[PDB]
Design a protein around this ligand. Structure first.
Ligand SMILES: [Mg+2]
Ligand SMILES: [Mg+2]
Ligand SMILES: [Mg+2]
Ligand SMILES: [Mg+2]
Ligand SMILES: [Mg+2]
Ligand SMILES: [Mg+2]
Ligand SMILES: [Mg+2]
Ligand SMILES: [Mg+2]
Ligand SMILES: [Mg+2]
Ligand SMILES: [Mg+2]
Ligand SMILES: [Mg+2]
Ligand SMILES: [Mg+2]
Ligand SMILES: [Mg+2]
Ligand SMILES: [Mg+2]
Ligand SMILES: [Mg+2]
Ligand SMILES: [Mg+2]
Ligand SMILES: [Mg+2]
Ligand SMILES: [Mg+2]
Ligand SMILES: [Mg+2]
Ligand SMILES: [Mg+2]
Ligand SMILES: [Mg+2]
Ligand SMILES: [Mg+2]
Ligand SMILES: [Mg+2]
Ligand SMILES: [Mg+2]
Ligand SMILES: [Mg+2]
Ligand SMILES: [Mg+2]
Ligand SMILES: [Mg+2]
Ligand SMILES: [Mg+2]
Ligand SMILES: [Mg+2]
Ligand SMILES: [Mg+2]
Ligand SMILES: [Mg+2]
Ligand SMILES: [Mg+2]
Ligand SMILES: [Mg+2]
Ligand SMILES: [Mg+2]
Ligand SMILES: [Mg+2]
Ligand SMILES: [Mg+2]
Ligand SMILES: [Mg+2]
Ligand SMILES: [Mg+2]
Ligand SMILES: [Mg+2]
Ligand SMILES: [Mg+2]
Ligand SMILES: [Mg+2]
Ligand SMILES: [Mg+2]
Ligand SMILES: [Mg+2]
Ligand SMILES: [Mg+2]
Ligand SMILES: [Mg+2]
Ligand SMILES: [Mg+2]
Ligand SMILES: [Mg+2]
Ligand SMILES: [Mg+2]
Ligand SMILES: [Mg+2]
Ligand SMILES: [Mg+2]
Ligand SMILES: [Mg+2]
Ligand SMILES: [Mg+2]
Ligand SMILES: [Mg+2]
Ligand SMILES: [Mg+2]
Ligand SMILES: [Mg+2]
Ligand SMILES: [Mg+2]
Ligand SMILES: [Mg+2]
Ligand SMILES: [Mg+2]
Ligand SMILES: [Mg+2]
Ligand SMILES: [Mg+2]
Ligand SMILES: [Mg+2]
Ligand SMILES: [Mg+2]
Ligand SMILES: [Mg+2]
Ligand SMILES: [Mg+2]
Ligand SMILES: [Mg+2]
Ligand SMILES: [Mg+2]
Ligand SMILES: [Mg+2]
Ligand SMILES: [Mg+2]
Ligand SMILES: [Mg+2]
Ligand SMILES: [Mg+2]
Ligand SMILES: [Mg+2]
Ligand SMILES: [Mg+2]
Ligand SMILES: [Mg+2]
Ligand SMILES: [Mg+2]
Ligand SMILES: [Mg+2]
Ligand SMILES: [Mg+2]
Ligand SMILES: [Mg+2]
Ligand SMILES: [Mg+2]
Ligand SMILES: [Mg+2]
Ligand SMILES: [Mg+2]
Ligand SMILES: [Mg+2]
Ligand SMILES: [Mg+2]
Ligand SMILES: [Mg+2]
Ligand SMILES: [Mg+2]
Ligand SMILES: [Mg+2]
Ligand SMILES: [Mg+2]
Ligand SMILES: [Mg+2]
Ligand SMILES: [Mg+2]
Ligand SMILES: [Mg+2]
Ligand SMILES: [Mg+2]
Ligand SMILES: [Mg+2]
Ligand SMILES: [Mg+2]
Ligand SMILES: [Mg+2]
Ligand SMILES: [Mg+2]
Ligand SMILES: [Mg+2]
Ligand SMILES: [Mg+2]
Ligand SMILES: [Mg+2]
Ligand SMILES: [Mg+2]
Ligand SMILES: [Mg+2]
Ligand SMILES: [Mg+2]
Ligand SMILES: [Mg+2]
Ligand SMILES: [Mg+2]
Ligand SMILES: [Mg+2]
Ligand SMILES: [Mg+2]
Ligand SMILES: [Mg+2]
Ligand SMILES: [Mg+2]
Ligand SMILES: [Mg+2]
Ligand SMILES: [Mg+2]
Ligand SMILES: [Mg+2]
Ligand SMILES: [Mg+2]
Ligand SMILES: [Mg+2]
Ligand SMILES: [Mg+2]
Ligand SMILES: [Mg+2]
Ligand SMILES: [Mg+2]
Ligand SMILES: [Mg+2]
Ligand SMILES: [Mg+2]
Ligand SMILES: [Mg+2]
Ligand SMILES: [Mg+2]
Ligand SMILES: [Mg+2]
Ligand SMILES: [Mg+2]
Ligand SMILES: [Mg+2]
Ligand SMILES: [Mg+2]
Ligand SMILES: [Mg+2]
Ligand SMILES: [Mg+2]
Ligand SMILES: [Mg+2]
Ligand SMILES: [Mg+2]
Ligand SMILES: [Mg+2]
Ligand SMILES: [Mg+2]
Ligand SMILES: [Mg+2]
Ligand SMILES: [Mg+2]
Ligand SMILES: [Mg+2]
Ligand SMILES: [Mg+2]
Ligand SMILES: [Mg+2]
Ligand SMILES: [Mg+2]
Ligand SMILES: [Mg+2]
Ligand SMILES: [Mg+2]
Ligand SMILES: [Mg+2]
Ligand SMILES: [Mg+2]
Ligand SMILES: [Mg+2]
Ligand SMILES: [Mg+2]
Ligand SMILES: [Mg+2]
Ligand SMILES: [Mg+2]
Ligand SMILES: [Mg+2]
Ligand SMILES: [Mg+2]
Ligand SMILES: [Mg+2]
Ligand SMILES: [Mg+2]
Ligand SMILES: [Mg+2]
Ligand SMILES: [Mg+2]
Ligand SMILES: [Mg+2]
Ligand SMILES: [Mg+2]
Ligand SMILES: [Mg+2]
Ligand SMILES: [Mg+2]
Ligand SMILES: [Mg+2]
Ligand SMILES: [Mg+2]
Ligand SMILES: [Mg+2]
Ligand SMILES: [Mg+2]
Ligand SMILES: [Mg+2]
Ligand SMILES: [Mg+2]
Ligand SMILES: [Mg+2]
Ligand SMILES: [Mg+2]
Ligand SMILES: [Mg+2]
Ligand SMILES: [Mg+2]
Ligand SMILES: [Mg+2]
Ligand SMILES: [Mg+2]
Ligand SMILES: [Mg+2]
Ligand SMILES: [Mg+2]
Ligand SMILES: [Mg+2]
Ligand SMILES: [Mg+2]
Ligand SMILES: [Mg+2]
Ligand SMILES: [Mg+2]
Ligand SMILES: [Mg+2]
Ligand SMILES: [Mg+2]
Ligand SMILES: [Mg+2]
Ligand SMILES: [Mg+2]
Ligand SMILES: [Mg+2]
Ligand SMILES: [Mg+2]
Ligand SMILES: [Mg+2]
Ligand SMILES: [Mg+2]
Ligand SMILES: [Mg+2]
Ligand SMILES: [Mg+2]
Ligand SMILES: [Mg+2]
Ligand SMILES: [Mg+2]
Ligand SMILES: [Mg+2]
Ligand SMILES: [Mg+2]
Ligand SMILES: [Mg+2]
Ligand SMILES: [Mg+2]
Ligand SMILES: [Mg+2]
Ligand SMILES: [Mg+2]
Ligand SMILES: [Mg+2]
Ligand SMILES: [Mg+2]
Ligand SMILES: [Mg+2]
Ligand SMILES: [Mg+2]
Ligand SMILES: [Mg+2]
Ligand SMILES: [Mg+2]
Ligand SMILES: [Mg+2]
Ligand SMILES: [Mg+2]
Ligand SMILES: [Mg+2]
Ligand SMILES: [Mg+2]
Ligand SMILES: [Mg+2]
Ligand SMILES: [Mg+2]
Ligand SMILES: [Mg+2]
Ligand SMILES: [Mg+2]
Ligand SMILES: [Mg+2]
Ligand SMILES: [Mg+2]
Ligand SMILES: [Mg+2]
Ligand SMILES: [Mg+2]
Ligand SMILES: [Mg+2]
Ligand SMILES: [Mg+2]
Ligand SMILES: [Mg+2]
Ligand SMILES: [Mg+2]
Ligand SMILES: [Mg+2]
Ligand SMILES: [Mg+2]
Ligand SMILES: [Mg+2]
Ligand SMILES: [Mg+2]
Ligand SMILES: [Mg+2]
Ligand SMILES: [Mg+2]
Ligand SMILES: [Mg+2]
Ligand SMILES: [Mg+2]
Ligand SMILES: [Mg+2]
Ligand SMILES: [Mg+2]
Ligand SMILES: [Mg+2]
Ligand SMILES: [Mg+2]
Ligand SMILES: [Mg+2]
Ligand SMILES: [Mg+2]
Ligand SMILES: [Mg+2]
Ligand SMILES: [Mg+2]
Ligand SMILES: [Mg+2]
Ligand SMILES: [Mg+2]
Ligand SMILES: [Zn+2]
Lengths: 53, 64
RNA sequence: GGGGGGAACCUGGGGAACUGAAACAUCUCAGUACCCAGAGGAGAGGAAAGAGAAAUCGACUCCCUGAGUAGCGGCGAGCGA
RNA sequence: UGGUUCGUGGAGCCAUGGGGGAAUCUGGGCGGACCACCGCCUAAGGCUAAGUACUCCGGGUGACCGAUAGCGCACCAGUAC
RNA sequence: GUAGGGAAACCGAGUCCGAACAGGGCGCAGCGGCCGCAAAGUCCGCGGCCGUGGACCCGAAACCGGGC
RNA sequence: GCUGGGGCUAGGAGUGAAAAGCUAACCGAGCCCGGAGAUAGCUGGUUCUCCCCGAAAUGACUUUAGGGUCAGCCUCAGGCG
RNA sequence: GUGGAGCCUGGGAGUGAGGGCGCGAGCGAUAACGUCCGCGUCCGAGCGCGGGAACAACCGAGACCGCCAGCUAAGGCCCCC
RNA sequence: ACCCGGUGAAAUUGAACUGGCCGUGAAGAUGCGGCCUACCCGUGGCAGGACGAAAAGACCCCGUGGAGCUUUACUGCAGCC
RNA sequence: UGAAAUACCACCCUGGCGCGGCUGGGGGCCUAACCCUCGGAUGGGGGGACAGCGCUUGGCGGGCAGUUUGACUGGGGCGGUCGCCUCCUAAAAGGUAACGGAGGCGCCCAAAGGUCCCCUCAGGCGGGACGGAAAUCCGCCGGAGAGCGCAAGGGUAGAAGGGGGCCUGACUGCGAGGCCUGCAAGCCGAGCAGGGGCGAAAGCCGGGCCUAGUGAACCGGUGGUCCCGUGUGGAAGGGCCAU
């Protein structure tokens, strides 16, 4: 992690809860992450989005 | 004069029915983003303190 | 009528530091030591603008207990209803 | 600001140095920010035995000392120095 | 002391995590001949060691208060 | 200039033609009594007899390094065998 | 393999300045009664005893007491002896 | 200073029946080994030794010891704005 | 006639003006609070609502106060060093010191991750326009000397290397049993459940060939939960999960 390799949370787009923390490089990956993850709340895979840590 | 309960131990620890000493795993207070889920999950449990360390903490809790 | 004295005890007005925190400043020591004023054979307190959950109690003082509980605390050392 | 367990804390309560500043029960204070409800209590005047503390003083009693002990002093000692 | 588990609400020989009737953590279960015997536990005594006190005795340089 | 007598200024204070000089024969903060049995991870000292066993001077961590906590190594009691 | 063996639960420690020597290395200079590790030993605690002239740790050897008895160990057997 | 009459201290002192050499030994030996030397006890003198005496080294380091002093160390206070 | 249309009366705006209330800032003057002063004083004179003094705000402040000012170390200082990784020392298990010998880390990758499928290097010689020691092409030899993001070591083509397709397992709930170990930490992990990815399937996937890329507690922030809520309902504030 650095000024350019930032930390970030991923949020259930269906239930709005942040379920995973991870990292990315914002120079190489400027767009907000979107990943399918298991939502422990919604109990199924859900598209999750990068949301500010 | 009577002994005093050590409040820092009273707040961190519990003496189980058989007199083991139990506390939360250390190491997920923060700096957690790059810790695997196995790590965070396992640090979420209680553990039984090593005997010499537990016996010491027990004497701080004379009235539990 | 006062004034001045009295070993401790008592109330009030002021009020440290070593030390402890294995350094130290908040904190501790401690509202202690000590200075002062005043009382008296005691002094203080005392008859709810109380307590605090009981549909309750019933001035104050003092002992046992409640309880090293509840809490307070560089949530440390410790302090403590 | 102090007091309380309460060190600024969600910090009420009691007290009060500064500023502002009411009402007389249809008044007011309180039950831990605040609000409502439901209760408790009557501030801004005073006094009040006893149960409590102490031991200069008198007496009684010691699995207390016995002249390097026990009070500093058993004796002309708060003396000689 | 006779119940534990849980931050807690709370449930209870269980309870906590968990979607779980999964898995796991921490818990639960005398001898002889109804009689005796032993025992949880608890009280008192005694002893070792620990905590708080000056805490095995003696020793500072210093610091603070009030006086001379 | 020196000197008698009579006075005033003191403890973080005085006084000093200045040396941290002097303030009652030791002043980089007087003396007495008190907090007080300050604290001393340092030095010293620690008192009868016999019998059994019998170490360590390493490791980890430590504002730690001649101090500690845990472990190792000694010893006692109970259990196992 | 029955030993002051071992294992388990608990009470009490002390130690956490080591040192010489042999072997294996590093450091040093194929120096130090040097230094720093490893394996072993002994002194430490066996400054008790024999040998080594004397001498903690080299060789011999683990001192419960007594004997005007015997055998040995290392080392010795010309006199000191 | 010395001798006789008179009066008569002191620090220090484990005890002492207290030689030299070459060695040895915690590395500078009266006290150990081997040798050498040496009748017993004083008085006046000298200072090489008794690591002589005095002073729990003042240099040096160590102690999470103290104090005085400094500053654009930290934190606060007086004072001033 | 435009969105709205006309005289006349209101409730109210844009801006601006003069009276006024009430004020905030400046300027001038007054006197009587307050201060100074005057043989004289219920007064005169001077300053004057300032100054002083109370409460509060922020600042300057060794004048003073309380203190702090690390350890290792062939004495101490000066210099150097302090955690983590790799090799050696290390005496063929583990471990093992010195201010012994050499180097590295404090990142990174949205692919540089999962899976399916495919492919195989460096280098040497010979051949080929621009074209060279070395660009790209063809041939033969070539087991790994290349590659594997970065130090080193171990590993590795029967792939961990290279290319492509689909993907997010860089899961959630746990976790038998172990490695290591004073503690606390650190490490590996089959398996079951939930919902997925790739694959025809067997199966693989709880990040990365591996060993560094890190920081306990306390205090606090943010999202969630809806557990506590000081007579009661809320609220304040806290707990819990995540960060
Ligand atoms: Mg605490
Ligand atoms: Mg944690
Ligand atoms: Mg933390
Ligand atoms: Mg957290
Ligand atoms: Mg948090
Ligand atoms: Mg990772
Ligand atoms: Mg994970
Ligand atoms: Mg994660
Ligand atoms: Mg979870
Ligand atoms: Mg109790
Ligand atoms: Mg219990
Ligand atoms: Mg009087
Ligand atoms: Mg009187
Ligand atoms: Mg008072
Ligand atoms: Mg008064
Ligand atoms: Mg006071
Ligand atoms: Mg004062
Ligand atoms: Mg203090
Ligand atoms: Mg003290
Ligand atoms: Mg203490
Ligand atoms: Mg201290
Ligand atoms: Mg201390
Ligand atoms: Mg200090
Ligand atoms: Mg202090
Ligand atoms: Mg104290
Ligand atoms: Mg106090
Ligand atoms: Mg007082
Ligand atoms: Mg007193
Ligand atoms: Mg009086
Ligand atoms: Mg009476
Ligand atoms: Mg009375
Ligand atoms: Mg009275
Ligand atoms: Mg009344
Ligand atoms: Mg109770
Ligand atoms: Mg107090
Ligand atoms: Mg107030
Ligand atoms: Mg207070
Ligand atoms: Mg708080
Ligand atoms: Mg309060
Ligand atoms: Mg007031
Ligand atoms: Mg009313
Ligand atoms: Mg009212
Ligand atoms: Mg009130
Ligand atoms: Mg009020
Ligand atoms: Mg209220
Ligand atoms: Mg009330
Ligand atoms: Mg009331
Ligand atoms: Mg009264
Ligand atoms: Mg009466
Ligand atoms: Mg009374
Ligand atoms: Mg009496
Ligand atoms: Mg009497
Ligand atoms: Mg008698
Ligand atoms: Mg006598
Ligand atoms: Mg006497
Ligand atoms: Mg006698
Ligand atoms: Mg008398
Ligand atoms: Mg006497
Ligand atoms: Mg006498
Ligand atoms: Mg006399
Ligand atoms: Mg279970
Ligand atoms: Mg019985
Ligand atoms: Mg019993
Ligand atoms: Mg103990
Ligand atoms: Mg005491
Ligand atoms: Mg004592
Ligand atoms: Mg004691
Ligand atoms: Mg003392
Ligand atoms: Mg002094
Ligand atoms: Mg001081
Ligand atoms: Mg001072
Ligand atoms: Mg003084
Ligand atoms: Mg004074
Ligand atoms: Mg004159
Ligand atoms: Mg004169
Ligand atoms: Mg005079
Ligand atoms: Mg004069
Ligand atoms: Mg003067
Ligand atoms: Mg003076
Ligand atoms: Mg004076
Ligand atoms: Mg002074
Ligand atoms: Mg001065
Ligand atoms: Mg002069
Ligand atoms: Mg004097
Ligand atoms: Mg003097
Ligand atoms: Mg003098
Ligand atoms: Mg002098
Ligand atoms: Mg001083
Ligand atoms: Mg002083
Ligand atoms: Mg006094
Ligand atoms: Mg004291
Ligand atoms: Mg004391
Ligand atoms: Mg001290
Ligand atoms: Mg000291
Ligand atoms: Mg003793
Ligand atoms: Mg033995
Ligand atoms: Mg060691
Ligand atoms: Mg450690
Ligand atoms: Mg450290
Ligand atoms: Mg530290
Ligand atoms: Mg020390
Ligand atoms: Mg130990
Ligand atoms: Mg053993
Ligand atoms: Mg033991
Ligand atoms: Mg036994
Ligand atoms: Mg046996
Ligand atoms: Mg044995
Ligand atoms: Mg043994
Ligand atoms: Mg014992
Ligand atoms: Mg110890
Ligand atoms: Mg020790
Ligand atoms: Mg040590
Ligand atoms: Mg050592
Ligand atoms: Mg040593
Ligand atoms: Mg050894
Ligand atoms: Mg050694
Ligand atoms: Mg030798
Ligand atoms: Mg050796
Ligand atoms: Mg040999
Ligand atoms: Mg060697
Ligand atoms: Mg080596
Ligand atoms: Mg040579
Ligand atoms: Mg040596
Ligand atoms: Mg050598
Ligand atoms: Mg050598
Ligand atoms: Mg050895
Ligand atoms: Mg020794
Ligand atoms: Mg021997
Ligand atoms: Mg031995
Ligand atoms: Mg011996
Ligand atoms: Mg010998
Ligand atoms: Mg011999
Ligand atoms: Mg011989
Ligand atoms: Mg020997
Ligand atoms: Mg024997
Ligand atoms: Mg024979
Ligand atoms: Mg022979
Ligand atoms: Mg011979
Ligand atoms: Mg003559
Ligand atoms: Mg004569
Ligand atoms: Mg003799
Ligand atoms: Mg002689
Ligand atoms: Mg020699
Ligand atoms: Mg000698
Ligand atoms: Mg010699
Ligand atoms: Mg001799
Ligand atoms: Mg002799
Ligand atoms: Mg001799
Ligand atoms: Mg001889
Ligand atoms: Mg000779
Ligand atoms: Mg002579
Ligand atoms: Mg001489
Ligand atoms: Mg002379
Ligand atoms: Mg001599
Ligand atoms: Mg000499
Ligand atoms: Mg000398
Ligand atoms: Mg001497
Ligand atoms: Mg001394
Ligand atoms: Mg000394
Ligand atoms: Mg010294
Ligand atoms: Mg010096
Ligand atoms: Mg030195
Ligand atoms: Mg020093
Ligand atoms: Mg320090
Ligand atoms: Mg230290
Ligand atoms: Mg200091
Ligand atoms: Mg100081
Ligand atoms: Mg000025
Ligand atoms: Mg004017
Ligand atoms: Mg005028
Ligand atoms: Mg005027
Ligand atoms: Mg004017
Ligand atoms: Mg003004
Ligand atoms: Mg005034
Ligand atoms: Mg203000
Ligand atoms: Mg201020
Ligand atoms: Mg200063
Ligand atoms: Mg300053
Ligand atoms: Mg000063
Ligand atoms: Mg202090
Ligand atoms: Mg510091
Ligand atoms: Mg420091
Ligand atoms: Mg040092
Ligand atoms: Mg050096
Ligand atoms: Mg050293
Ligand atoms: Mg060295
Ligand atoms: Mg040296
Ligand atoms: Mg040295
Ligand atoms: Mg340096
Ligand atoms: Mg690190
Ligand atoms: Mg090795
Ligand atoms: Mg090796
Ligand atoms: Mg090895
Ligand atoms: Mg080996
Ligand atoms: Mg191992
Ligand atoms: Mg170094
Ligand atoms: Mg480097
Ligand atoms: Mg790709
Ligand atoms: Mg890969
Ligand atoms: Mg792929
Ligand atoms: Mg080729
Ligand atoms: Mg070619
Ligand atoms: Mg060409
Ligand atoms: Mg070519
Ligand atoms: Mg390679
Ligand atoms: Mg590189
Ligand atoms: Mg798909
Ligand atoms: Mg396990
Ligand atoms: Mg472990
Ligand atoms: Mg599947
Ligand atoms: Mg599945
Ligand atoms: Mg499929
Ligand atoms: Mg798996
Ligand atoms: Mg990779
Ligand atoms: Mg990696
Ligand atoms: Mg980690
Ligand atoms: Mg803290
Ligand atoms: Mg801390
Ligand atoms: Mg928190
Ligand atoms: Mg409520
Ligand atoms: Mg609720
Ligand atoms: Mg309330
Ligand atoms: Mg409502
Ligand atoms: Mg509710
Ligand atoms: Mg609401
Ligand atoms: Mg909330
Ligand atoms: Mg919340
Ligand atoms: Mg959490
Ligand atoms: Zn969800």
């Amino acid at each position: 992690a650095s000024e350019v390799r930032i930390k970030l949370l991923l949020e259930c787009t269906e239930c709005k809860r942040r379920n995973y923390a991870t990292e990315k490089n914002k120079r190489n990956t400027p767009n907000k992450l979107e990943l399918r993850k298991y939502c422990p709340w919604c109990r199924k895979h859900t598209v999750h989005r990068e949301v500010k840590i | 004069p009577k002994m005093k309960t050590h409040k820092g131990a009273k707040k961190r620890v519990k003496i189980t029915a058989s007199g083991k000493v139990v506390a939360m795993k250390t190491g997920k207070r923060h700096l957690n983003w790059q810790k695997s889920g196995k790590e965070i999950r396992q640090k979420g449990r209680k553990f039984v303190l090593a005997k010499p360390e537990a016996e010491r903490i027990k004497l701080l809790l004379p009235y539990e």
